[PDB]
Amino acid sequence: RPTFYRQELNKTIWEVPERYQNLSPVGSGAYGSVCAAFDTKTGHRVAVKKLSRPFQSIIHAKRTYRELRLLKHMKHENVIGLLDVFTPARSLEEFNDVYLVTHLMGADLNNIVKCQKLTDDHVQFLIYQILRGLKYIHSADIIHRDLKPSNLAVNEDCELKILDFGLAHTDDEMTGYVATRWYRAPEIMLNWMHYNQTVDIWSVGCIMAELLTGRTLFPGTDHIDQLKLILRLVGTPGAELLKKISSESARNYIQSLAQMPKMNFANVFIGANPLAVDLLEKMLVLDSDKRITAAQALAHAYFAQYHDPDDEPVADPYDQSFESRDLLIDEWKSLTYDEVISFVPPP
Numbered sequence: 405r406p407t408f409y410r411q412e413l414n415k416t417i418w419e420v421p422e423r424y425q426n427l428s429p430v431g432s433g434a435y436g437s438v439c440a441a442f443d444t445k446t447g448h449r450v451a452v453k454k455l456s457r458p459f460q461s462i463i464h465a466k467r468t469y470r471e472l473r474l475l476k477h478m479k480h481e482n483v484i485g486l487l488d489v490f491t492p493a494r495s496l497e498e499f500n501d502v503y504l505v506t507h508l509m510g511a512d513l514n515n516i517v518k519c520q521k522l523t524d525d526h527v528q529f530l531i532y533q534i535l536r537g538l539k540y541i542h543s544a545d546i547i548h549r550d551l552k553p554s555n556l557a558v559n560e561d562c563e564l565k566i567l568d569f570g571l572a573h574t575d576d577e578m579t580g581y582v583a584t585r586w587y588r589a590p591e592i593m594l595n596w597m598h599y600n601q602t603v604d605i606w607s608v609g610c611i612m613a614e615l616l617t618g619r620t621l622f623p624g625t626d627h628i629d630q631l632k633l634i635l636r637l638v639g640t641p642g643a644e645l646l647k648k649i650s651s652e653s654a655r656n657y658i659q660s661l662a663q664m665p666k667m668n669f670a671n672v673f674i675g676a677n678p679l680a681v682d683l684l685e686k687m688l689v690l691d692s693d694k695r696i697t698a699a700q701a702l703a704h705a706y707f708a709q710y711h712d713p714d715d716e717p718v719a720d721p722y723d724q725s726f727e728s729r730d731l732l733i734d735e736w737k738s739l740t741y742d743e744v745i746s747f748v749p750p751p
């Protein structure tokens with residue numbers, strides 16, 4: 405066990421191993437607080453996150469376990485990984501606090517999109533890396549659920565990592581003119597379907613469109629306005645898809661709208677590479693069964709310059725049976741403690 409030292413930063417106590425030096429606050433959320441630091445063992449600049457109230461309820465304890473399980477599994481060049489996890493506690497009986505350590509990320513794709521002039525080669529490389537990471541995530545039967553520009557880190561060499569997996573966002577967070585909803589698939593925006601991995605491909609289509617034009621694709625002022633923007637571009641549901649729609653709330657509202665045809669994407673995305681237009685038409689489909697998958701998209705001709713089927717790896721299997729398990733707070737807490745003490749750092 406390393407030696408730990410204590411300090412108070414912005415009214416919070418931080419108790420961390422001596423290896424982490426020069427802690428400086430960089431933000432707070434509802435799930436924790438974050439400090440930048442220098443890691444003397446590896447030489448990296450790191451982000452250290454102290455979870456807030458990790459075991460305050462059954463829901464919160466299960467969420468803490470879920471986050472740690474996910475971060476310990478993800479080992480891929482285009483996905484955020486876990487550098488370290490620690491607790492100052494010396495036993496399960498005194499265990500209360502959890503700290504997570506990752507590489508410190510600078511710019512996100514929002515910063516790139518609003519300030520930089522992107523060539524077609526830039527869009528190719530950025531979307532290629534998203535899809536490479538998504539092939540890996542989906543091969544473990546994980547759904548990201550929250551892909552958007554602020555959850556994609558990008559460095560000076562245009563290299564990209566996927567961040568901030570959806571841990572299961574409030575109704576207030578998705579209300580009104582908010583980027584938190586602009587990238588969500590139409591079948592989940594009003595919970596007309598259960599989540600599945602095809603929702604992430606819709607999000608990729610929205611992101612790629614925004615890199616090509618510099619503008620949000622579906623900036624709705626509320627859920628209904630956003631659905632209308634979507635249906636104007638892709639058309640109202642055809643007979644084949646309506647037959648598959650199980651939700652009675654969806655059918656009733658959908659049938660109240662005048663029918664509209666799918667628009668011509670070459671007249672929407674003026675000047676874009678025709679191969680980019682073709683890929684967008686394969687992502688932005690209402691029938692989620694018919695959307696292109698991440699593995700299929702990597703082989704599309706738009707990525708010919710970067711695609712290498714011997715360098716697009718899949719994940720080890722990921723056991724999610726805990727998600728259907730009913731446990732007490734202290735049982736989730738003990739499971740989390742086991743995962744903290746068994747962590748082995750990357751080479």
Ligand SMILES: CCCc1ccc(NC(C)=O)cc1O
Binds near residue numbers: 648689
């Ligand atoms: C405006 C329609 C919203 C919607 C509702 C359901 C589905 N179902 C499938 C299987 O893809 C897909 C949808 O796009």
Ligand SMILES: [Cl-]
Binds near residue numbers: 406407421422423424
């Ligand atoms: Cl140390």
Ligand SMILES: [Cl-]
Binds near residue numbers: 491492493498499500
């Ligand atoms: Cl503790």
Ligand SMILES: [Cl-]
Binds near residue numbers: 514553554555
């Ligand atoms: Cl965003």
Ligand SMILES: [Cl-]
Binds near residue numbers: 721724
């Ligand atoms: Cl597993």
Ligand SMILES: [Mg+2]
Binds near residue numbers: 554555568
């Ligand atoms: Mg985020």
